[PDB]
Amino acid sequence: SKLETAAKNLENQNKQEYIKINEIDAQGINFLATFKADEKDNLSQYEEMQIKRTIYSSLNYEKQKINTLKEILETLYNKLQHRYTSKEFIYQIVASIQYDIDRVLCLIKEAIIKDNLHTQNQKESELLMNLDSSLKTRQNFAKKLNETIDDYNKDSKNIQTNVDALATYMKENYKTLDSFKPI
Amino acid sequence: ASKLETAAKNLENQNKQEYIKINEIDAQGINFLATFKADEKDNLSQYEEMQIKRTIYSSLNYEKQKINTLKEILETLYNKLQHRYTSKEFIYQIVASIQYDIDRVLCLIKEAIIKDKESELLMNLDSSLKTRQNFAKKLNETIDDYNKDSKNIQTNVDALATYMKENYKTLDSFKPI
Protein backbone atom coordinates (compact mmCIF):
# COMPACT_ATOMS: atom_id res chain seq x y z
CA SER A 1 0.00 0.00 0.00
CA LYS A 2 1.00 3.60 -0.89
CA LEU A 3 1.31 4.88 2.73
CA GLU A 4 3.08 1.67 3.78
CA THR A 5 5.65 2.11 0.95
CA ALA A 6 5.97 5.78 1.71
CA ALA A 7 6.83 5.12 5.35
CA LYS A 8 9.23 2.32 4.35
CA ASN A 9 11.22 4.41 1.88
CA LEU A 10 11.37 7.34 4.34
CA GLU A 11 12.39 5.02 7.15
CA ASN A 12 15.34 3.67 5.13
CA GLN A 13 16.12 7.15 3.91
CA ASN A 14 16.23 8.35 7.51
CA LYS A 15 18.52 5.46 8.53
CA GLN A 16 21.01 6.14 5.74
CA GLU A 17 21.17 9.81 6.80
CA TYR A 18 21.75 8.86 10.45
CA ILE A 19 24.72 6.60 9.46
CA LYS A 20 26.24 9.08 7.01
CA ILE A 21 25.92 12.00 9.43
CA ASN A 22 27.54 10.08 12.25
CA GLU A 23 30.36 9.07 9.91
CA ILE A 24 31.19 12.61 8.96
CA ASP A 25 30.86 13.76 12.55
CA ALA A 26 33.06 10.93 13.88
CA GLN A 27 36.00 12.74 12.34
CA GLY A 28 35.89 15.71 14.81
CA ILE A 29 34.17 18.33 12.60
CA ASN A 30 31.98 19.98 15.27
CA PHE A 31 29.59 21.61 12.87
CA LEU A 32 27.47 23.33 15.45
CA ALA A 33 29.99 23.66 18.26
CA THR A 34 29.55 27.44 18.45
CA PHE A 35 25.76 27.00 18.89
CA LYS A 36 26.36 24.28 21.48
CA ALA A 37 28.53 26.64 23.50
CA ASP A 38 25.63 29.11 23.61
CA GLU A 39 23.92 29.44 27.03
CA LYS A 40 20.99 31.58 25.84
CA ASP A 41 19.47 28.75 23.78
CA ASN A 42 20.04 25.03 24.30
CA LEU A 43 20.63 22.98 21.24
CA SER A 44 19.62 19.52 22.31
CA GLN A 45 21.20 16.54 20.63
CA TYR A 46 17.84 15.94 18.74
CA GLU A 47 17.61 19.53 17.51
CA GLU A 48 21.21 19.16 16.32
CA MET A 49 20.57 15.93 14.43
CA GLN A 50 17.55 17.32 12.66
CA ILE A 51 19.47 20.35 11.60
CA LYS A 52 22.27 18.15 10.19
CA ARG A 53 19.85 15.83 8.36
CA THR A 54 18.77 18.77 6.18
CA ILE A 55 22.13 20.48 5.87
CA TYR A 56 24.37 17.47 5.30
CA SER A 57 21.98 15.83 2.88
CA SER A 58 21.74 19.19 1.17
CA LEU A 59 25.49 19.52 0.84
CA ASN A 60 25.89 15.93 -0.13
CA TYR A 61 27.91 14.98 2.90
CA GLU A 62 30.93 16.91 1.54
CA LYS A 63 32.94 17.91 4.59
CA GLN A 64 34.42 20.85 2.74
CA LYS A 65 31.09 22.40 1.95
CA ILE A 66 29.87 21.82 5.50
CA ASN A 67 32.96 23.53 6.82
CA THR A 68 32.31 26.54 4.61
CA LEU A 69 28.80 26.78 5.88
CA LYS A 70 30.21 26.52 9.38
CA GLU A 71 32.41 29.51 8.73
CA ILE A 72 29.48 31.48 7.29
CA LEU A 73 27.40 30.81 10.38
CA GLU A 74 30.23 31.47 12.81
CA THR A 75 31.11 34.75 11.15
CA LEU A 76 27.46 35.85 11.54
CA TYR A 77 27.30 34.52 15.10
CA ASN A 78 30.47 36.31 16.14
CA LYS A 79 29.02 39.63 15.04
CA LEU A 80 26.50 40.56 17.70
CA GLN A 81 24.54 42.72 15.21
CA HIS A 82 23.92 39.64 13.01
CA ARG A 83 24.03 36.78 15.49
CA TYR A 84 20.24 36.40 15.16
CA THR A 85 20.44 35.75 11.47
CA SER A 86 22.59 32.66 12.07
CA LYS A 87 20.15 31.47 14.70
CA GLU A 88 17.12 32.12 12.52
CA PHE A 89 18.72 30.27 9.58
CA ILE A 90 19.31 27.31 11.94
CA TYR A 91 16.27 27.23 14.18
CA GLN A 92 13.68 28.85 11.90
CA ILE A 93 14.49 27.74 8.39
CA VAL A 94 16.62 24.61 8.47
CA ALA A 95 14.85 23.05 11.39
CA SER A 96 11.39 23.70 9.97
CA ILE A 97 12.25 22.21 6.63
CA GLN A 98 13.19 19.10 8.52
CA TYR A 99 10.26 19.05 10.91
CA ASP A 100 7.74 19.17 8.20
CA ILE A 101 9.12 16.02 6.73
CA ASP A 102 9.14 14.39 10.09
CA ARG A 103 5.66 15.57 11.02
CA VAL A 104 4.16 13.86 7.99
CA LEU A 105 5.89 10.62 8.67
CA CYS A 106 4.73 10.83 12.22
CA LEU A 107 1.16 11.12 10.79
CA ILE A 108 1.44 8.62 8.02
CA LYS A 109 2.52 6.19 10.66
CA GLU A 110 -0.69 6.95 12.55
CA ALA A 111 -2.83 6.09 9.61
CA ILE A 112 -1.01 2.87 9.00
CA ILE A 113 -1.31 1.69 12.63
CA LYS A 114 -4.31 3.24 14.39
CA ASP A 115 -6.70 3.67 11.47
CA ASN A 116 -8.77 1.22 9.50
CA LEU A 117 -8.73 1.03 5.73
CA HIS A 118 -11.60 3.50 5.15
CA THR A 119 -10.16 6.37 7.13
CA GLN A 120 -6.75 5.34 5.81
CA ASN A 121 -8.02 5.91 2.33
CA GLN A 122 -9.56 9.27 3.19
CA LYS A 123 -6.29 10.68 4.73
CA GLU A 124 -4.18 9.04 2.05
CA SER A 125 -4.07 11.63 -0.73
CA GLU A 126 -3.42 14.57 1.56
CA LEU A 127 -0.61 12.94 3.48
CA LEU A 128 1.04 11.92 0.22
CA MET A 129 0.73 15.37 -1.18
CA ASN A 130 2.16 16.91 2.01
CA LEU A 131 4.98 14.39 2.01
CA ASP A 132 5.85 15.30 -1.50
CA SER A 133 5.69 19.01 -0.79
CA SER A 134 7.87 18.78 2.24
CA LEU A 135 10.59 16.75 0.36
CA LYS A 136 10.49 19.17 -2.59
CA THR A 137 10.88 22.10 -0.15
CA ARG A 138 14.02 20.54 1.21
CA GLN A 139 15.33 20.01 -2.34
CA ASN A 140 14.77 23.68 -3.17
CA PHE A 141 16.52 24.70 -0.02
CA ALA A 142 19.43 22.38 -0.93
CA LYS A 143 19.67 23.82 -4.41
CA LYS A 144 19.77 27.27 -2.83
CA LEU A 145 22.31 26.16 -0.22
CA ASN A 146 24.79 24.97 -2.90
CA GLU A 147 24.42 28.23 -4.75
CA THR A 148 25.26 29.99 -1.50
CA ILE A 149 28.41 27.91 -0.84
CA ASP A 150 29.60 28.66 -4.36
CA ASP A 151 28.73 32.36 -4.03
CA TYR A 152 30.66 32.49 -0.80
CA ASN A 153 33.78 30.94 -2.28
CA LYS A 154 33.68 33.40 -5.16
CA ASP A 155 33.10 36.32 -2.68
CA SER A 156 30.14 37.33 -4.84
CA LYS A 157 28.76 40.63 -3.60
CA ASN A 158 31.61 40.75 -1.10
CA ILE A 159 29.86 38.04 0.93
CA GLN A 160 33.15 36.58 2.24
CA THR A 161 34.78 39.92 2.77
CA ASN A 162 31.86 41.75 4.31
CA VAL A 163 29.79 40.40 7.15
CA ASP A 164 27.14 43.05 6.60
CA ALA A 165 26.93 42.00 2.97
CA LEU A 166 26.87 38.40 4.15
CA ALA A 167 24.00 39.15 6.52
CA THR A 168 21.98 40.77 3.78
CA TYR A 169 22.46 37.84 1.47
CA MET A 170 21.40 35.25 4.05
CA LYS A 171 18.38 37.42 4.87
CA GLU A 172 17.28 37.82 1.20
CA ASN A 173 17.78 34.12 0.21
CA TYR A 174 16.35 32.49 3.28
CA LYS A 175 13.45 34.82 4.04
CA THR A 176 10.89 32.27 4.83
CA LEU A 177 10.29 28.48 4.81
CA ASP A 178 7.33 29.07 2.42
CA SER A 179 9.61 30.51 -0.24
CA PHE A 180 11.22 27.09 -0.71
CA LYS A 181 7.86 25.32 -1.17
CA PRO A 182 6.81 24.27 -4.62
CA ILE A 183 4.53 26.70 -6.39
CA ALA B 1 18.31 21.52 28.92
CA SER B 2 14.58 21.59 29.21
CA LYS B 3 12.68 18.71 30.65
CA LEU B 4 11.27 17.98 27.22
CA GLU B 5 14.69 18.08 25.68
CA THR B 6 15.95 15.55 28.27
CA ALA B 7 12.78 13.46 27.79
CA ALA B 8 13.33 13.23 24.02
CA LYS B 9 17.06 12.42 24.56
CA ASN B 10 16.42 9.54 26.96
CA LEU B 11 13.68 8.17 24.70
CA GLU B 12 15.83 8.49 21.62
CA ASN B 13 18.71 6.55 23.27
CA GLN B 14 16.36 4.03 24.56
CA ASN B 15 14.88 3.59 21.05
CA LYS B 16 18.29 3.11 19.47
CA GLN B 17 19.41 0.44 21.89
CA GLU B 18 16.15 -1.45 21.26
CA TYR B 19 16.72 -1.38 17.48
CA ILE B 20 20.21 -2.85 17.85
CA LYS B 21 19.16 -5.52 20.39
CA ILE B 22 16.13 -6.53 18.37
CA ASN B 23 18.17 -6.92 15.21
CA GLU B 24 20.75 -8.97 17.09
CA ILE B 25 18.20 -11.45 18.37
CA ASP B 26 16.49 -11.60 14.98
CA ALA B 27 19.81 -12.09 13.13
CA GLN B 28 19.81 -15.62 14.59
CA GLY B 29 16.90 -16.85 12.41
CA ILE B 30 14.12 -16.64 14.98
CA ASN B 31 11.26 -15.54 12.84
CA PHE B 32 9.08 -14.21 15.52
CA LEU B 33 6.17 -13.02 13.36
CA ALA B 34 6.63 -15.26 10.31
CA THR B 35 3.15 -16.69 10.55
CA PHE B 36 1.66 -13.17 10.55
CA LYS B 37 3.88 -12.19 7.65
CA ALA B 38 2.60 -15.06 5.60
CA ASP B 39 -0.96 -13.72 6.11
CA GLU B 40 -2.61 -12.18 3.02
CA LYS B 41 -5.66 -10.72 4.82
CA ASP B 42 -3.61 -8.32 6.89
CA ASN B 43 -0.30 -6.72 6.33
CA LEU B 44 2.60 -6.35 8.60
CA SER B 45 4.98 -3.89 7.18
CA GLN B 46 8.50 -4.07 8.43
CA TYR B 47 7.90 -0.91 10.49
CA GLU B 48 4.81 -2.26 12.07
CA GLU B 49 6.80 -5.41 12.80
CA MET B 50 9.60 -3.52 14.41
CA GLN B 51 7.21 -1.56 16.59
CA ILE B 52 5.51 -4.78 17.76
CA LYS B 53 9.00 -6.24 18.61
CA ARG B 54 10.02 -3.13 20.49
CA THR B 55 7.25 -3.69 23.05
CA ILE B 56 7.45 -7.46 23.16
CA TYR B 57 11.24 -7.97 23.19
CA SER B 58 11.83 -5.18 25.68
CA SER B 59 9.03 -6.66 27.79
CA LEU B 60 10.63 -10.12 27.76
CA ASN B 61 14.11 -8.69 28.30
CA TYR B 62 15.45 -9.89 24.98
CA GLU B 63 15.39 -13.51 26.22
CA LYS B 64 15.15 -15.66 23.10
CA GLN B 65 13.53 -18.53 25.02
CA LYS B 66 10.69 -16.33 26.26
CA ILE B 67 10.12 -14.87 22.80
CA ASN B 68 10.00 -18.32 21.28
CA THR B 69 7.37 -19.44 23.85
CA LEU B 70 5.29 -16.35 23.00
CA LYS B 71 5.68 -17.26 19.36
CA GLU B 72 4.23 -20.74 20.08
CA ILE B 73 1.35 -19.20 21.97
CA LEU B 74 0.49 -16.92 19.14
CA GLU B 75 0.93 -19.57 16.43
CA THR B 76 -1.20 -22.02 18.26
CA LEU B 77 -4.00 -19.42 18.46
CA TYR B 78 -3.50 -18.40 14.82
CA ASN B 79 -3.66 -21.97 13.54
CA LYS B 80 -7.02 -22.48 15.17
CA LEU B 81 -9.54 -20.62 13.03
CA GLN B 82 -11.89 -20.09 15.96
CA HIS B 83 -9.21 -18.17 17.88
CA ARG B 84 -7.09 -16.68 15.13
CA TYR B 85 -8.58 -13.25 15.87
CA THR B 86 -7.30 -13.31 19.46
CA SER B 87 -3.70 -13.62 18.19
CA LYS B 88 -4.27 -10.73 15.77
CA GLU B 89 -5.99 -8.55 18.40
CA PHE B 90 -3.15 -9.20 20.86
CA ILE B 91 -0.69 -8.11 18.18
CA TYR B 92 -2.43 -5.31 16.31
CA GLN B 93 -4.76 -4.01 19.01
CA ILE B 94 -2.84 -4.38 22.23
CA VAL B 95 0.85 -4.60 21.59
CA ALA B 96 0.93 -2.14 18.71
CA SER B 97 -1.14 0.42 20.59
CA ILE B 98 0.98 0.24 23.65
CA GLN B 99 3.91 0.97 21.36
CA TYR B 100 2.03 3.61 19.34
CA ASP B 101 1.13 5.75 22.29
CA ILE B 102 4.79 5.95 23.26
CA ASP B 103 5.78 6.76 19.74
CA ARG B 104 3.10 9.34 19.43
CA VAL B 105 4.21 11.23 22.51
CA LEU B 106 7.77 11.51 21.19
CA CYS B 107 6.70 12.77 17.77
CA LEU B 108 4.88 15.42 19.85
CA ILE B 109 7.50 16.23 22.30
CA LYS B 110 9.86 16.72 19.42
CA GLU B 111 7.33 18.99 17.87
CA ALA B 112 7.14 21.20 20.86
CA ILE B 113 10.91 21.40 21.19
CA ILE B 114 11.34 22.68 17.61
CA LYS B 115 8.31 24.38 16.07
CA ASP B 116 7.06 26.09 19.25
CA LYS B 117 2.08 21.73 26.56
CA GLU B 118 4.98 20.71 28.78
CA SER B 119 3.32 19.26 31.80
CA GLU B 120 0.68 17.34 29.75
CA LEU B 121 3.23 15.81 27.33
CA LEU B 122 5.32 14.72 30.34
CA MET B 123 2.24 13.24 32.00
CA ASN B 124 1.33 11.35 28.82
CA LEU B 125 4.87 10.20 28.37
CA ASP B 126 5.00 8.80 31.88
CA SER B 127 1.58 7.17 31.43
CA SER B 128 2.43 5.55 28.16
CA LEU B 129 5.73 4.09 29.53
CA LYS B 130 3.92 2.86 32.62
CA THR B 131 1.27 1.22 30.49
CA ARG B 132 4.04 -0.68 28.72
CA GLN B 133 5.56 -1.66 32.06
CA ASN B 134 2.26 -3.02 33.29
CA PHE B 135 1.82 -4.96 30.02
CA ALA B 136 5.39 -6.33 30.37
CA LYS B 137 4.78 -7.45 33.89
CA LYS B 138 1.62 -9.18 32.69
CA LEU B 139 3.43 -10.76 29.75
CA ASN B 140 6.04 -12.37 32.00
CA GLU B 141 3.31 -13.76 34.21
CA THR B 142 1.79 -15.28 31.08
CA ILE B 143 4.96 -16.92 29.88
CA ASP B 144 5.53 -18.46 33.32
CA ASP B 145 1.89 -19.57 33.47
CA TYR B 146 2.27 -21.12 29.99
CA ASN B 147 5.37 -23.07 30.91
CA LYS B 148 3.62 -24.42 34.01
CA ASP B 149 0.52 -25.30 31.93
CA SER B 150 -1.57 -23.32 34.53
CA LYS B 151 -5.31 -23.76 33.86
CA ASN B 152 -4.23 -26.14 31.03
CA ILE B 153 -3.11 -23.24 28.82
CA GLN B 154 -0.39 -25.25 27.10
CA THR B 155 -2.53 -28.33 26.87
CA ASN B 156 -5.70 -26.68 25.76
CA VAL B 157 -5.94 -24.11 23.02
CA ASP B 158 -9.47 -23.17 24.09
CA ALA B 159 -8.20 -22.61 27.60
CA LEU B 160 -5.34 -20.67 26.11
CA ALA B 161 -7.73 -18.46 24.21
CA THR B 162 -9.81 -17.68 27.22
CA TYR B 163 -6.68 -16.75 29.28
CA MET B 164 -5.35 -14.40 26.60
CA LYS B 165 -8.85 -12.86 26.37
CA GLU B 166 -9.15 -12.31 30.10
CA ASN B 167 -5.59 -10.95 30.65
CA TYR B 168 -5.33 -8.74 27.55
CA LYS B 169 -8.85 -7.36 27.28
CA THR B 170 -8.03 -3.79 26.24
CA LEU B 171 -5.16 -1.31 26.15
CA ASP B 172 -6.93 0.76 28.87
CA SER B 173 -6.60 -2.04 31.35
CA PHE B 174 -2.86 -1.62 31.40
CA LYS B 175 -2.93 2.14 32.00
CA PRO B 176 -2.16 3.58 35.45
CA ILE B 177 -4.68 5.31 37.64
Residue numbers in the entry:
A (entry chain A): 12 to 194
B (entry chain B): 11 to 126, 134 to 194
Relevant lines from the article:
Two CspA orthologous proteins, BGA71 and BGA66, that are capable of binding complement system components C7, C8, and C9 and thus inhibiting the assembly of the MAC have been identified in B. bavariensis, allowing B. bavariensis to escape the attack by the immune system. The importance of BGA71 and BGA66 in the resistance to the immune system was supported by the gain of resistance to complement-mediated killing after expression of either protein in the serum-sensitive B. garinii strain G132. In conclusion, we have solved the crystal structure of the key complement inhibitory protein BGA71 from B. bavariensis. The overall fold of the BGA71 protein looks similar (Cα root-mean-square deviation from 1.66 Ǻ to 2.63 Ǻ) to the previously released crystal structures of the orthologous PFam54 proteins CspA, BBA64, BBA66, and BBA73 of B. burgdorferi.
All three BGA71 constructs were overexpressed in E. coli, but only BGA7162-251 yielded crystals, suggesting that the flexible region present in the other two constructs interfered with the crystal formation, as previously observed for the BBA66 protein of B. burgdorferi. The crystals used for collection of native diffraction data also belonged to the space group P31, but the unit cell size was smaller and only six molecules were found per asymmetric unit with a water content of approximately 45%. The final model of BGA7162-251 was generated for residues 69–251 since the first four residues that remained after cleavage of the His-tag and residues 66–68 were not built due to weak electron density. By surveying the crystal structure of BGA71, we identified cysteine 173 in α-helix D as the residue that forms disulfide bridges, which is responsible for cross-linking of the two monomers. Furthermore, comparative sequence analysis of the PFam54 orthologous proteins reveals that cysteine 173 is not present in any other orthologous PFam54 protein, suggesting that dimerization by cysteine cross-linking is a unique feature of BGA71. The structure of CspA showed the highest similarity to BGA71 among the other PFam54 orthologs of B. burgdorferi, with a Cα root-mean-square deviation of 1.66 Ǻ. While BGA71 did not bind CFH and CFHL-1, an interaction with components C7 and C9 has been demonstrated. However, the lack of binding complement regulators can be explained by the inability of BGA71 to form a homodimer in the same manner as CspA. However, the proposed N-terminal residues 37–63 involved in the binding of C7 and C9 are not visible in the crystal structure of BGA71 since they form a flexible loop region connecting the protein structural domain to the cell surface.
